Structure 1
Amino acid sequence: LHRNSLIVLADVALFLALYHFLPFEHNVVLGISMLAFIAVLWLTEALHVTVTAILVPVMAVFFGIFETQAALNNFANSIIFLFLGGFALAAAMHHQGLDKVIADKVLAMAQGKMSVAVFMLFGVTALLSMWISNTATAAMMLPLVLGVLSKVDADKQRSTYVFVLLGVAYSASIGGIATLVGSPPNAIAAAEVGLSFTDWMKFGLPTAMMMLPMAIAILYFLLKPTLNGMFELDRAPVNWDKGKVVTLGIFGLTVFLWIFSSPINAALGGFKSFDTLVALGAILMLSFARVVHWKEIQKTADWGVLLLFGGGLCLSNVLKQTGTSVFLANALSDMVSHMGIFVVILVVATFVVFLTEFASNTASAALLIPVFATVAEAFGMSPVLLSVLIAVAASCAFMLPVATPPNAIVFASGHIKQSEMMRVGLYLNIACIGLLTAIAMLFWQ
């Protein structure tokens, strides 16, 4: 009766169809049928991301691909727990109020200029999206954006005030491309190809360093009239209280180990998922120091995303076990040989940066990383590059809303116009496809 209710039934039919008509070895048919089924569900999202993810293992088990416990073990992957540390790390400095004090101590640095205001709102958003989330950083930033945009409230000066709204929403997504925690897509890559925190930072951090300015400039060089305006510093001051230094200290300590995991771990015996152990040690320190209770983490934590990780890891394992990964690498063998690696990384980047416009960032990476990664292995190529690429290009949702939550968040402000974003993003999208392929090429040898 509902829209989504139909996709699910249409998708069940599409699966039943592909299943009974594809003319290949059953193992490959099964993998192809499953892949199409999930690919639709995750891209239309007729069912919640996590429900689809939970559907992966239950399918693999009934179709004899794996035994129940084998499939489920994907959900205990060490990266899933490193991402859980990121949440508890967030939950702490929010329940501590350390995220609000971070905004204030910065916005006061702008003595009163709207010029040095919106430009600080962008920087704060991207910085906070490195650790918290992207959807969460938007919701927590939007009021702070509408607050500053109330002295110069004249909305007939819209362009000063859609530049700020669209500015933060983009800063949230570009900030998430900075660290392994920040956006689910980044974790899906690390869990698929086994990346370290500092490994993904070698790639992501410089890219985010670059992409954030390139994105604001594009917004500036339309109708920016922000060189005018004044502030309305109405609010209670902040001050470092009980173990906000401790929390801030713990946090810094944790990020320190994450960055330096390589030598510290080697000089300790070479533990397995060292970054994961650090993330779990953070969860412990924060609780011994009493600075954050568990109910906080259970709320802050996105357990659906964690369940999702298991489904993508399970999906990747289904593609291999069924041989579908090699079956597809064959059908592309000629087509990809006609193409260089430049053409390859450029075609991929383009495909996702626009595919991610119609679906969630993570729901896109959840589907694309398993396929392209396992196929890249059939070609005997290291899936790091393609994976890292897809993870970054997935976070490049700038056109219409519905691409990322941060879009629909600043869009529900009833102030920015559909058409406006649809064309500012069409320019940014192209700028990224350029920047990405550039960086991707250099990140070759």
Structure 2
Amino acid sequence: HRNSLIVLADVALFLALYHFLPFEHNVVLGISMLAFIAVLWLTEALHVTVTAILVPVMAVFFGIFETQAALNNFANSIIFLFLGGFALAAAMHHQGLDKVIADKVLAMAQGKMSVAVFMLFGVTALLSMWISNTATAAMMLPLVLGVLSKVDADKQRSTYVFVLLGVAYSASIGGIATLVGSPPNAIAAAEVGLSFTDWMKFGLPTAMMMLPMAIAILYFLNWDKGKVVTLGIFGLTVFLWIFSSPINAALGGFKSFDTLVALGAILMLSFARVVHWKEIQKTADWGVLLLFGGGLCLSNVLKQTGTSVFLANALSDMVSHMGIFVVILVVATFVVFLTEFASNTASAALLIPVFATVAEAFGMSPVLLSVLIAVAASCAFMLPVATPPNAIVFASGHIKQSEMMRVGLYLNIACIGLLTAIAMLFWQ
């Protein structure tokens, strides 16, 4: 098989770098492992989650860590914070609160199909804030192929494809609004120790910023049992997540209050009888939760082996020849196009550790580089296979490769500017 070969080619690459690199043995091991994992996660020869499990087993066998020490990475408080958003979404999905949120809004439009399509994007993004991106796309597709029925002029495409590629992008942009939504966001918060309210001040403005800018580029070319309870619980959870900073301070200063709030939601949602656990066990993408830990284990492997300081010293002369503007532009541009070839989270899981640890060796706040990479990782708009939402609206057998390949080439450059701009403002 194709992927079965990438594994063997990666094993050879490891042995080569392991035996031939003329550096301190630990740096060789750290460099070799980093290259190994990098391939397995970008090519996906092995499932993103399978590669994550391979990270600790390597560090353990090569004396980097002891068994239990390596496994402990998979229990970060952020992982449970994301699991709360899964049970929170599963709750209002099993309850049907996502469809009713679409009807009451889609029906808010009197009957104008012209202004209806615009409302389809705003919901896909708002739903992605709490549910997901692949799921938000798969859930919106049937609701998109429903409005398109009064006038199905398949020959008329400048009024037809715009609505499909829009939701595939609104789902990806909506996931950049909150810590929950896209896995990459969680990987950043877990690396630097961000709170939920910390990441919303960053991403939400960008989501508010990037959504209109994205549409412009395309343009110019019944309340039943405890649905108020689900809303009450949901509203209460989001309220604490925003006000977690002062609430926790005025309670004794609990460590990971955002995580505590997320777990309480699972309790209220289960106490309120509104969602059964078998529902939560299905909605939660346990493979992604394992990926979170796998990325942290790799990050710690870089530190314990000194690969972070070895690469920081190697890039010392290059980053000094560049300004802070030049750096974040190369990074932003590098990822904005890299995420087009590989999975969103698979890209973030690899770059967030490398950059955050090297930036930490430079005595620089790793928040900037980390949050930036997490946002640009969700900027896959060209060809499909970049993000499932892209292949979801792409599976409609209508949108052309070259059409999307060039509309995304415009949006990509557009985002690199918006990101580098906002990234420079969030400095002093």
TM range (shorter): over 0.9
SS at structure 1 position matched to 2:155: helix
| Inter-partner Cα distance in structure 2 for 1:155 and 1:143 | 18
Structure 1 residues 39-67: Cα deviation after superposition (integer angstroms, max 9, x where no partner): 01100000001000000000100001000
Give distance in 1, aligned partners of 2:13 and 2:146: 49
After TM superposition, give the deviation of residue 36 of structure 1 in Å: 0.2
Deviation of 1:153 (Å): 1.0
How far did 1:110 drift? 1.2
TM-score, normalised via structure 2 length = 0.99
Q: Using the alignment, how far apart are the partners of 2:157 and 2:95 within structure 1?
A: 35
For 2:330 and 2:64, how far apart are their aligned partners in 1?
32
Match of 1:327 among 301, 307, 310: 310
1:10 offset after TM fit, Å?
0.5
- What's the secondary structure of 2:73's corresponding residue? helix
Distance 1:6 1:286 in 2: 46
CA drift at 1:113: 1.2
1:291 partnered with 2:274 = yes
Per-residue deviation at 1:115?
Answer: 1.3
Cα distance in 1 for partners of 2:150, 2:3 equals 43
1:65 alignment partner, SS class? coil
Kindly provide the CA deviation profile for residues 302-330 of structure 1, in whole angstroms up to 9, marking residues without a partner as x: 00000000000100000000000000001
Per-residue deviation at 1:158?
Answer: 1.5
The alignment's C-alpha RMSD in Å is 1.8
Cα distance between partner residues in 2 of 1:59 and 1:113:
58
2-structure distance, mates of 1:115, 1:8: 50
Q: Does 147-156 or 63-72 show the bigger shift? A: 147-156
Listed one character per residue, the Cα deviations across residues 58-99 of structure 1 (whole Å, up to 9, x for unaligned) are 010000100010111110110000000000000000000000
Distance in 2 (CA, whole Å) between partners of 1:11 and 1:149 is 47
**Structure 1 residue 108 displacement after superposition:** 0.5
Query: Paired residue for 1:56?
Result: 55
Displacement of 1:438: 0.6
Deviation at 1:160, TM superposition (A): 1.1
Q: CA deviation at 1:112?
A: 1.2
- Uncovered stretches (5+) of structure 1, i.e. residues with no partner: 221-237
Distance in 2, matches of 1:132 and 1:157, equals 33
Map Cα deviations across residues 121-141 of structure 1 (whole Å, 9 max, x no partner).
000100000000000000000
Q: CA deviation at 1:151?
A: 1.4
* Partners of 2:294 and 2:56 in 1: CA distance: 7
Deviation digits for residues 263-294 of structure 1 (CA, Å, limit 9, x no counterpart): 10000000000000000000000011100000
- TM superposition shift of 1:349: 0.2
In structure 2, distance between residues paired with 1:159 and 1:105: 28
Q: Which runs of 4+ in 1 moved over 6 A?
A: none
How far apart are 1:111 and its partner, in Å? 1.3
Deviation at 1:145, TM superposition (A): 0.5
Per the TM alignment, residue 116 of structure 1 is displaced from its structure 2 partner at its CA by: 1.1
Query: How far 1:433 moved relative to its partner?
Result: 0.4
CA distance in 1, matches of 2:392, 2:61: 40
Please state how far the C-alpha of 1:163 moved relative to its aligned partner. Answer: 0.1
The answer as to 2:104 corresponding to 1:109 is no
1:133-162 superposed Cα distances (whole Å, 9 cap, x missing partner): 000000000011011111111111112111
Q: Aligned with 1:160: secondary structure? A: coil
List runs of 5+ in structure 2 lacking aligned partners: none
Aligned residues: 427
What secondary structure does 1:157 align onto?
coil
What is the distance in 2 between the residues matched to 1:386 and 1:335?
A: 16
Quick one: distance in 1 between partners of 2:149 and 2:159?
A: 12
Tell whether 2:334 aligns with 1:351. Answer: yes
Offset, 1:197: 0.2
